[model samples]
Target: TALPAFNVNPNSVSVSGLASGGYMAAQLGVAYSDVFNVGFGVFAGGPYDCARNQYYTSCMYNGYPSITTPTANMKSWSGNQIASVANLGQRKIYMWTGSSDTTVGPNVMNQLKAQLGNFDNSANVSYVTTTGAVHTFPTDFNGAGDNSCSLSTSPYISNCNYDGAGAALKWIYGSLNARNTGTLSGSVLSFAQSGSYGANGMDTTGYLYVPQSCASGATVCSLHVALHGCLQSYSSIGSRFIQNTGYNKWADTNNMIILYPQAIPDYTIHAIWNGGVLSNPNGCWDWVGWYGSNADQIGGVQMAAIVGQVKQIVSGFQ
Candidate 1:
C-alpha cells in the first residue's frame, strides 16, 4: 500500500531502471509526476501494450511464449500509464536501450517511445542504442573495474562501456541543476570535515575537490555530487571518478566542485547508504530510492539541502 505522500520537498530530477525495476520507476514517475521533473529509463520494457506483442515478451522472458494477456493485467498494474493519461504535461522522460538486446528488444522500447510521442516537447526523451549489446546492463562499458558483469564472457552480449553510468548521472544532474536557483560553491574540505546527517546516524560524508588554481575571488563553482554504487564508498570509488577511465577528469579542467559522497558501514562490514534495505546491509546511495522510500525523490532537493547546511558551517564559498 502507498503511504501518505510525505511533505518532504520533491525531487526535480529522478532515474528509473530496466525490466521489472525499470517498469516500476516509470510508474513512480508517472504516478508521482508532480514530485519529479525529469526521469531516466534504462532498457525499460515500456507498457503492456508494447509488451503484449509476442516478440516483445519472447525477448523479455527468454523466448518462452506465455498466454497471459498483459493488456488486461495492465489495467491493474499500469500505474504510470493511467497517471500519465491524467497528467500528460508534467514530466520529462529520457530513455536508453541496447540495440542488440534480445530481451526487452529495441522494438519494445520503441513502442513505449511512440506512446510518449506527444510528450516530445514536454518530456525531454532521448534514447541510446548500445551497438551489439544484449539485455544485461553494461557495467564495464566505461571500462570501470567495479562492474562484475563481463560482456566478453557472455555470448548473449557484445560490447560495453562504463561511461554510460557517468553519462546518465550527468544527464540527470545537468537537467536538475540547469536552473542554478541554489548557490553553486566550492571549498577545500578534508575527509575529516565531511560529516553526516539523517536519523539513523549514517555518515553521509564527502570530499570536496576544488581546482588547485582559481581566479581572484570567483563567486561560484559547479558542484558535482559523485555517488558511489552499492557496497562502494568514497575512498574506494573516489579515484575511479577521475583516475579510472577519465570519467571525471573534466571537472578539474572545468573548475567545478566535485563531492564524492562516502557510504558508511552499517551492520555489515561493507559500507552502505541508509537507503532502507533489509537484505545486504552494506550498500551505497539508493539513487533508485529503494528503502528510504526516497528512490523517486530528486537528488537536487536533498543535495541542495546538504549544500545549504555546508554553507552555514563553511566560509568564503558560493
Candidate 2:
C-alpha cells in the first residue's frame, strides 16, 4: 500500500516560512525538536513566545510602531519557555527581516535573535536585514513571484533581487545542487489533511511537490516543509501563492520533497484555523494559543497535525 512506511533519513527534515508561517516554523523547530531538530528559517517572524498569552497588542503591535515595552517583555517572558523545552537550544536558525517592513518590524526579529541566543546559540543563527524588501517573501526579480519587491501586497512574494527560497534551502542544507530553472518536471500532489493528519481548522487538502528523482526508488530524499504567510493561501490568492512562491525549482534538483501545508477559513472567530481565543481575520496559521492553552508546547493540536502529515510524507520516501 502507498501508506506503508517508506525508508527515510529521519534527521534530514527541515522547515521554513515567512511572517505568520515564520512564527510557526520557529515554534515547530523548537517544540518538536524530536521531529525537525535539524533547523528552520524565518523571515519577519518574532521569538517563540513573542505573543504567548496575549495575541493582538503584545505580539502584533511590538514592531507595528516599534513598541519597546511588549517586545522586551516578551523576550523576558520567553525565558521559562526557552528553559522548559529540551534540546531547543541546538536548532540552527536562518532569519531575515526587511528594513522597510512596517508590519512586523525588525525590533521583534532582533528580540527573536536575542531569545534564540539562550536556546539556539548566537553563532549558529544567520540574521540578516534587507534594505528594501517589504513584508513579503524576497525574490531575485520583480514579479518573479508576486507584486513589487518593496510593496507589501497580495500573494506576499516580493522581488527584492534576493533568492530567499534558495538561500533558506542552502543555509539549512549546505552545498545544495543548483536549482532547476528549466521545466520543473515535478508533480504537486494534493493529499487529504483532516483524515490523515487530524487538522482542525486547516484545509481538508494539503500540497506537496515531489521531484521526479525523489519520487522514484532511485534516491531517498530530504524533506522541507514550506508554510505561507497571511492571506497567501489558495483561497485568497489561488494557485499563485503555492505554485509561484518559488520553492519547487531548488527542490527539483536537490532531491528534496517540499511539503506545503494549507489553512482555510473558520467563520466563527478568524478567517483562519480554529481562531479560538484570537480573532485572526487574515487566514493566518496559529503560532500561539489559539488551539488551546499552551498549544505552543509539544502535542499542541495543530503542531501534532503538522507532524502527522510529515510522517506520512516520510513514509512515501521509498
Candidate 3:
C-alpha cells in the first residue's frame, strides 16, 4: 500500500492503532519510519516472541500455539524485524496496556517497549497501565471510573475502563502546531478563485486558500486545505471556516489560509472525494481511496493532490 501524502511536515504526522490493529500500526512505524514521525499503540502485541497463546497470538504464530496438535498449527511468525532495524530516532512511540489483559499479556508489550530502548529518550516512548483491565481499547472512560466497556451485561468479560480512542485523537490533534509562524509573505491564498483546466471543453469551479492577503501588494501566506468529512457538503464546511469554532478564527489569528473544497455528487446520493473508488459520475474526490468496491470515498491520493496543488499555487507567491 502506498503512503498517503500529507501537507504537514514529518513532525506533524501521528500514527496509532487499537488491539491487533495496534500491532499493525507498530509495523507501519517501523516499516514506514520516514512517513510517520510519531505513533501510539493501544493494546499492542509482539514486537517480541509470543508465549501467551491467546486470541492475539494468531497474528504472531505461524502454526498453532497449543492446538489439539493440528499439522497446520505449527508455524512461527517473526516480529517487526524491519522496524527494529529502521529505528526512527525522531519519532515518538506511545503505548498502553492493561494489567489483567488475557489476550496479549501486558508483559509482552512492556518487553517490546523495553527492547526499543532509548535510541532516543524516555519521552520518545511511554506506556500507561490500567489496573485490572482486560484486552481492549479504552474508548470510553469517565474520569470518575465509569466506562462503556464495563456496562456490558455479558459476564464473561470485564471492562478495563480505557479510552484508547480519545487518547488517539488527543495525540493526533496535539501533534499539530498550536502556533503559526507569523510570516505571511510567501504563504497561501484564501477565498474563491476560479481556474480552468484541460481541453475537454469542461470547466471546474472551486475555492482556493492561498496565504496571501487580499491587499494588492500583500505577501503570500501559508495555505492548508481542509476537506470535509462524509455527509458534509462544501457549503457547510465553508461556513465552518468563519464561525468561532471554525477555521476563520484560527486562520485570521494564525495568518494561515484554509481552503474548503466541494465534492461533486453523482448517483451515490452523497457528494464525496474521488481518490480511490469510482462509483460516482461527478467523480467526487476520494481522499482516503476505496473500501472494497464502494466508490467515490474520501482519502489517499485525493488529499495528496490537493496538497500538491496548494504547493504549486504557493510557489507563485514566493
**Using TM-score as the measure, which candidate wins?**
2
**Model 1 spans with C-alpha error above 4 angstroms:** 1-123, 132-162, 165-204, 212-219, 235-238, 245-247, 268-277, 287-318
**Local accuracy of candidate 3 as per-residue lDDT tens digits, 1-318:** 111112323233344444433543454444444444444343445442222223323433222232222111111111222333334566566777666665555765665565445243575565777776665444332322223342322121223544443344334344333422244332322332233211111113344333334223254333334333222233323332112112332344333444444444444432222222344343223312222111111112333333334444444342
> Please, what are the lDDT tens digits per residue for candidate 2 over residues 208-300?
888887766567788889988888766677667666767888999988888888876655553222233455556677775556555565667
lDDT of each: 0.41, 0.72, 0.37
Model 3 residue 301 CA deviation in Å: 17
Ranking by lDDT: 2, 1, 3
**Candidate 1 global TM-score:** 0.45
Question: Candidate 1: minimum summed lDDT over ten consecutive residues — where?
Answer: 1-10
- Please, what are the lDDT tens digits per residue for candidate 1 over residues 1-318? 111111112343343444543444454454444433444454434542233334333425333333244334333433443333334344446566666666566776666565555344443555677676655444343334433332422112112663454455456545322212122232335443233223121345544445433223343334433333333444434444333322234344444444443444445432223323333244333332323333323232233333333333233343
Candidate 1 lDDT (Cα, 0 to 1): 0.41
- Each model's TM-score, in the order given? 0.45, 0.87, 0.41
